From a paper:
CRAF (RAF1) is one of three RAF-family kinases that initiate MAP kinase signaling in response to activated RAS and is essential for oncogenic signaling from mutant KRAS. Like BRAF, CRAF is regulated by 14-3-3 engagement and by intramolecular autoinhibitory interactions of its N-terminal regulatory region. These structures reveal a fully autoinhibited conformation analogous to that observed for BRAF and two “open monomer” states in which the inhibitory interactions of the CRD and 14-3-3 dimer are released or rearranged, but the kinase domain remains inactive.
In the other there is no-defined orientation with respect to the 14-3-3, allowing reconstruction of the “isolated” CRAF/MEK1 kinase domain module. It appears that the 14-3-3 dimer still associates with the pSer621 site in the C-terminus of CRAF in this state, but due to the highly variable orientation of the 14-3-3 dimer, particles are aligned based on the larger CRAF/MEK1 kinase module, resulting in a 3D reconstruction that reveals only the CRAF and MEK1 kinase domains. The activation loop forms an autoinhibitory turn that locks the C-helix in an outward inactive position. Key residues that stabilize this state are conserved between CRAF and BRAF, including Val492 and Lys493 in the inhibitory turn (corresponding to Val600 and Lys601 in BRAF) and Phe360 in the P-loop (corresponding to Phe468 in BRAF). Obviously the dimerization interface is also fully exposed in the CRAF/MEK1 kinase domain open monomer, in which the 14-3-3 has no defined orientation with respect to the kinase domain. We do not ascribe a particular significance to the open monomer state as compared with the kinase domain open monomer; in both the CRD and pSer259 interactions are released and the CRAF kinase domain is exposed for dimerization.
Numbering used by the authors:
A (entry chain B): 62 to 266, 307 to 380
B (entry chain A): 341 to 612
């Protein structure tokens, strides 16, 4: 198993509203892994249930899902030990470079679709948190998904949270109606738009969190700026950003989409571009 | 007076973090609580506003509110307050599931109302009012902490307070969730947060247990589609207590009672 005393924090990878992630060294094994600290005050039974539900992540093995070593509760905090991703997350890459190039995004979207279909097919798990900060990259060019809803009790416990700044939630989830992987596809589409353009697209070229939620429930979905992107990419994001879940394209339609096939055929030096833009 | 010399204070084991700072246990002139504020580079305007709030909070002295000793600018930016050995109200209700009798619950409600009435009489809007910021000192005496501090809880766009909401959304009043006004924090928002605390006391559970997403909660509370359902209240809860909690969580801001009215209602309750 894993214990708090076995880790020596090297640096702070980053922090979110829920918690903070530390790049740590596992002394017994000597390998650098990422340790996410999620602070929450919950009952001991809820803690045990969250740990048990997170134990499913041991068989969540995919080239598009970040690795998992273990999870434990130390002191008022849930700690999940996942594989360290040198590239960080796509939010960091967006902070580095003005806008992600379209071909790299094609590669990212292929990775996101493959990870979502892996979770759905072999675990019946919805990501629920497809954000640029929840897609992690490697110095070797891998693209992987993290922070997906494996534990329902953890989701319930994190419902009691502090207010946020932005959101990538589909309108059907905000309105509270039935939601499926179409919600994750809407989130992917919003993330791809936010990474293709140099900004969060909810307020089309600040606004509080409720104003953003109201906009993405009661206003047309955002679209890529025409004239500087290929028609296939625009069509892909438009099919992902459809307010009605039924009209919205599912994973099967996205895979055979013209943009996905174009990007798969294209050869892009993702690792080299990542190293150039992040140093 | 004014700032505290950091050499005098000693930081003991860290306790935890919250919406705007991380709490450390201190030992300055006895046991104190030190919160290192998340603000890295406080603007001179922001720092001066924080020092004015610090003076105002220092002046306060009520049995049901924790003392605000002062601040220190050496250990980054930090605020020193009274340390409470007793557990928080949130831990009692939810984490520890403390079995309170009905009269103990009414007493906690009354003492919280007493402290909040003192704060509002001083023109202090205890934003971020919740079960986390209530401590049951000496077993049952209520202690309200983490009040005011709007200049530090809110990030600052330089000389401009971001003027956006912060803190837990389960207790947040709808009008300040929407942020339709630059100044949505008032006595009535504190009364709504107090009503959510009353709901926790009279149910033993957090509101909106059927919603497991924070953004869904934000949207549905701001749009008026979600309210804490009062069928969850205990059957032995007195009917006028139910009326008070209903009146405190009213969606309309002006419909919510002020804290003298809440105190009068609870005093009527205790005498039955
Ligand atoms: N395995 C990891 N390897 C490297 N960096 C990571 C890893 N996991 C998380 N991070 C970083 O830690 C940051 C904090 O992420 P989270 O704690 O999940 O919250 P978040 O991604 O910021 O999303 P929210 O909405 O703010 S909670 C991310 O933005 C990443 O940059
Ligand atoms: N004066 C205090 N005495 C004892 N424990 C305290 C005190 N103030 C805060 N704490 C504890 O410190 C931890 C974090 O508290 P805070 O930083 O104030 O966050 P919070 O009170 O949960 O919410 P906010 O909105 O940030 S004030 C919790 O475990 C509190 O119980
Ligand atoms: O971390 C989470 N959210 O953080 C960003 C906003 O969602 C998160 C949220 C919900 C959840 C349910 N079960 C685990 N959950 C998470 N943890 C997590 C899970 C798998 C991996 I691999 C890595 C992780 F960090
Ligand atoms: Mg994350
Ligand atoms: Mg507190």
């Amino acid at each position: 198993e894993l214990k708090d005393d076995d880790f020596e924090k090297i640096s702070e990878l980053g922090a979110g509203n829920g918690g903070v992630v530390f790049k740590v060294s596992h002394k017994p094994s000597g390998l650098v892994m990422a340790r996410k600290l999620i602070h929450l005050e919950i009952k001991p039974a809820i803690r045990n249930q969250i740990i048990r539900e997170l134990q499913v992540l041991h068989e969540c093995n995919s080239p598009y899902i970040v690795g998992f070593y273990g999870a434990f509760y130390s002191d008022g905090e849930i700690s999940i030990c996942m594989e360290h991703m040198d590239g960080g997350s796509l939010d960091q890459v967006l902070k580095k470079a003005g806008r992600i190039p379209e071909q790299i995004l094609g590669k990212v979207s292929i990775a996101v679709i493959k990870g979502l279909t892996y979770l759905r097919e072999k675990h019946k798990i919805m990501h629920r948190d497809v954000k640029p900060s929840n897609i992690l990259v490697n110095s070797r060019g891998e693209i992987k998904l993290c922070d997906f809803g494996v534990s329902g009790q953890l989701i319930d416990a994190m419902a009691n949270a502090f207010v946020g700044t932005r959101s990538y939630m589909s309108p059907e989830r905000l309105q509270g109606t039935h939601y499926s992987v179409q919600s994750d596809i809407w989130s992917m589409g919003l993330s791809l738009v936010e990474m293709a353009v140099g900004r969060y697209p909810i307020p089309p070229p600040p606004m509080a969190i409720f104003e953003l939620l109201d906009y993405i429930v009661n206003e047309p979905p955002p679209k890529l700026p025409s004239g500087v992107f290929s028609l296939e990419f625009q069509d892909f994001v438009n099919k992902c950003l459809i307010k009605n879940p039924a009209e919205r394209a599912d994973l099967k339609q996205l895979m055979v989409h013209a943009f996905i096939k174009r990007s798969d055929a294209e050869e892009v030096d993702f690792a080299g571009w990542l190293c150039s833009t992040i140093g | 007076y004014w700032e505290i010399e950091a050499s005098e204070v000693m930081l003991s084991t860290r306790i935890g973090s919250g919406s705007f700072g991380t709490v450390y246990k201190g030992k300055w002139h006895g046991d104190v609580a030190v919160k290192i504020l998340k603000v890295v580079d406080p603007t001179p305007e922001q720092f001066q506003a924080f020092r004015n709030e610090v003076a105002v909070l220092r002046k306060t002295r009520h049995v049901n509110i924790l003392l605000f000793m002062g601040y220190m600018t050496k250990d980054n930016l930090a605020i020193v307050t009274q340390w409470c050995e007793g557990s928080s109200l949130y831990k009692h209700l939810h984490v520890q599931e403390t079995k309170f009798q009905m009269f103990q619950l009414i007493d906690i409600a009354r003492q919280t109302a007493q402290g909040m009435d003192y704060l509002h009489a001083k023109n202090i809007i205890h934003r971020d009012m919740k079960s986390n910021n209530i401590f049951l000192h000496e077993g049952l005496t209520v202690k309200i902490g983490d009040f005011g501090l709007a200049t530090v809880k809110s990030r600052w766009s330089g000389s401009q307070q971001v003027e956006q909401p912060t803190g837990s959304v389960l207790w947040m009043a709808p009008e300040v969730i929407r942020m339709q006004d630059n100044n949505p924090f008032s006595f009535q928002s504190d009364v709504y947060s107090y009503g959510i605390v009353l709901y926790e006391l009279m149910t033993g559970e957090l509101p909106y247990s059927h919603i497991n997403n924070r953004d869904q909660i934000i949207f549905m509370v701001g749009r008026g589609y979600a309210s804490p359902d009062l069928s969850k209240l205990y059957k032995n809860c007195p009917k006028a207590m139910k009326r008070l909690v209903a009146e405190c969580v009213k969606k309309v801001k002006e419909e919510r009672p002020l804290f003298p009215q809440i105190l009068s209602s609870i005093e009527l309750l205790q005498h039955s």
